[PDB]
Amino acid sequence: GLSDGEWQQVLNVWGKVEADIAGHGQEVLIRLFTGHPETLEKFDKFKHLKTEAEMKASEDLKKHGTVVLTALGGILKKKGHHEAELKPLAQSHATKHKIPIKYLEFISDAIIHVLHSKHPGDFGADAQGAMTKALELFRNDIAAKYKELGFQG
Ligand SMILES: [C-]#N
Secondary structure (H helix, E strand, O other), X not given: OOOHXXXXXXXXHHHHHHHOHHHHHXXXXXXXXXXXXXXXXXXXXXXXXXXXXXXXXXXXXXXXXXXXHHHHHHHHHOOOOXXXXXHHHHHHHHHHOOOOOOHHHHHHHHHHHHHHHHOOOOOOHHHHHHHHHHHHHHHHHHHHHHHHOOOOO
């Protein structure tokens, strides 16, 4: 799905998330939780967070934000050759956590907003282009393993 010009544009932008990995996932997650309250109920450790301040105050959210981007960060450094790190997440999020594919759509959009907000001006038409594609290739590979186990379709 993507070339190196494009991969190279994805990793430069990732370069940005890594200087503040915990600030970028707290915000990503906040943005998911307030945008789609429904997703917050899946978590028995953050279901208690009614407000956005109880959320931003939360030291447990930021520790969960890190895991999220550390695990995502690693798939993308693979440049679509993620068959290995991905199998386990698809199979965890599907049989165990039972998260439908569109919640993965919510997070992706969520990531792309967050990148705008925090870098208001240094994430362009092309980077934005290439970051969408990779998050798309990502969802698609999972959809493919989500279809094998027959989790909703
Ligand atoms: C996982 N979030």
